[PDB]
Design a protein around this ligand. Structure first.
Ligand SMILES: C=CCO[C@]1(C(=O)O)C[C@@H](O[C@]2(C(=O)O)C[C@@H](O)[C@@H](O)[C@@H]([C@H](O)CO[C@]3(C(=O)O)C[C@@H](O)[C@@H](O)[C@@H]([C@H](O)CO)O3)O2)[C@@H](O)[C@@H]([C@H](O)CO)O1
Ligand SMILES: [Zn+2]
Lengths: 219, 217
């Protein structure tokens, strides 16, 4: 099981600086180039740089867009990869991936991390309020939701019954208004299963270390 | 400077049908030393990380279905999907690794399917939000096709458009539908001055609008 995991992402002031991390495992870290790739929400992937393998001296190269301003390093005893970002602007706001790169032969990014989201804003970390969307109607199925309102920055995660409600879920893209995000998540279950069996939304906002469970009770 | 450019920007196609998308390089990606074209294709499903489909232009990565074929040489490349499936909804990226690395702008593949009508659900403010001074009325238009749709909010039989924010989802990977939220945000005070709250979904699947409403009491 090759795994790549980015961390260090979150809210940063414009002009500020930030270091991201990429933890790797399940392959000989030292034999591979590793690259960093970013992506503004709704936009395209931009390659930022790589660091070569052992055989090639762990040397770095950068794209013209961030060259002289971003810095890649690796910890070969830990199988870790870093990106150091300086003098940030809102253009730098993006999900950042680390990807396994060249091994000396293959020309592919065979594996990618899940990405960590960076938001460059003077706005402040605001935790979310979480509201229960309870109905009542009737039908053979019933729809419930949670309203996640007034948080900053992105992202939040929403699960239902701790992930054991996986189908019938629609989590909607957040909308920004007056520097705050609001999104909702819907779940559809058999009318027969609710409210006999409980339905709970679990919302997380790691920027503010917020964790909320919200049980959906009949009004 | 190797600029990568992709075509088209977006297209929809029915399941079972064939898709070709193109990738152009500002110079040849043909390594003369190795006789391989350094061009890779990555598939990025909604909310997912990119995953590798093809490398050296035509080489399928293990696990990838034969439905996907990478073709081309020099400056012009193509990812063809022989029989498109509901799960192929994604943005596709080509990437050169001949002078460092550079991604194209991507092709967004959407899936055409039969028209479908939205399931509409309306939700009054929670007692929790109310006591804090706010009142959000939420309406879910779920699992409809196609994406173009209209919501009208009616308070006490009168249309209102202030404080209505709407949000569409990506296409579903299983059934190729869209869903959308319409959220009407009031103060508790305004919410209490009126008694009837109505969400109206108008969509090409019907001449008659789907209406969901609740009374404050
Ligand atoms: C620098 C002397 C000449 O190097 C070559 C040549 O370019 O003619 C290629 C060189 O290839 C190898 C090797 O040493 O076996 C393997 C090859 O796959 C690469 O790893 C290269 C380099 O390490 C460069 O790779 C990169 C880079 O680091 O910038 C990244 C790659 O993904 C790709 O972009 C290459 C690009 O295609 C240029 O090569 O650049 O090293 C080797 O074949 C020697 C040969 O022994 C003669 O000296 O020739
Ligand atoms: Zn009024």
């Amino acid at each position: 099981e090759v795994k790549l995991v980015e961390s260090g992402g979150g809210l940063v002031q414009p002009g500020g600086s930030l270091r991201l991390a990429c933890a790797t495992s399940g392959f000989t870290f030292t034999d591979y180039y590793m690259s960093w790739v970013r992506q503004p929400p709704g936009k395209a992937l931009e390659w930022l740089g790589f660091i070569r393998n052992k055989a090639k001296g762990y040397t770095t190269e950068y794209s013209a867009s961030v060259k002289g301003r971003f810095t890649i390093s690796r910890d070969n005893s830990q199988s870790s990869l870093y990106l150091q970002m300086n003098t940030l602007r809102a253009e730098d706001s993006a999900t950042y991936y680390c990807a396994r790169d060249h091994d000396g032969y293959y020309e592919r990014f065979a594996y990618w991390g899940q990405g960590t989201l960076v938001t460059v804003s003077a706005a402040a970390t605001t935790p979310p309020s979480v509201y229960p969307l309870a109905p009542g109607a009737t039908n053979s199925m019933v729809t419930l939701g949670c309203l996640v309102k007034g948080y900053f920055p992105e992202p939040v995660t929403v699960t239902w019954n701790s992930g054991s409600l996986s189908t019938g879920v629609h989590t909607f893209p957040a909308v920004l208004s007056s520097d705050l995000y609001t999104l909702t998540s819907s779940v559809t279950v058999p009318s027969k299963t609710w409210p006999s069996e409980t339905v709970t939304c679990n919302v997380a906002h790691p920027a503010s270390s917020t964790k909320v469970d919200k049980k959906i009770v009949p009004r | 400077d190797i600029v990568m450019t992709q075509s088209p920007s977006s297209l929809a196609v029915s399941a079972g049908e064939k898709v070709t998308m193109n990738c152009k390089s500002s110079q040849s990606l043909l390594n003369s030393r190795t006789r391989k074209n350094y061009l890779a294709w990555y598939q990025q499903k909604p909310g997912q990380s990119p995953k590798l489909l093809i490398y050296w232009a035509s080489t399928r990565e293990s696990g990838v279905p034969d439905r996907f074929t990478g073709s081309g040489s020099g400056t012009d490349f193509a990812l063809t999907i022989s029989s498109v499936q509901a799960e192929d909804l994604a943005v596709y990226y080509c990437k050169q690794s001949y002078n460092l690395r550079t991604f194209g702008g991507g092709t967004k593949l959407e899936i055409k399917r039969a028209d479908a009508a939205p399931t509409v659900s309306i939700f009054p403010p929670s007692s929790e939000q109310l006591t804090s001074g706010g009142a959000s009325v939420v309406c879910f238009l779920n699992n409809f096709y196609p994406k173009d749709i209209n919501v009208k909010w009616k308070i006490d039989g009168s249309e209102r458009a202030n404080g209505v924010l709407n949000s569409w989802t990506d296409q579903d990977s299983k059934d190729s539908t869209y869903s959308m939220t319409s959220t009407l945000t009031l103060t508790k005070d305004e919410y209490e001055r009126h008694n009837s709250y109505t969400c109206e979904a108008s969509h090409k699947t019907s001449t008659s609008p789907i209406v969901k409403s609740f009374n404050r009491n």
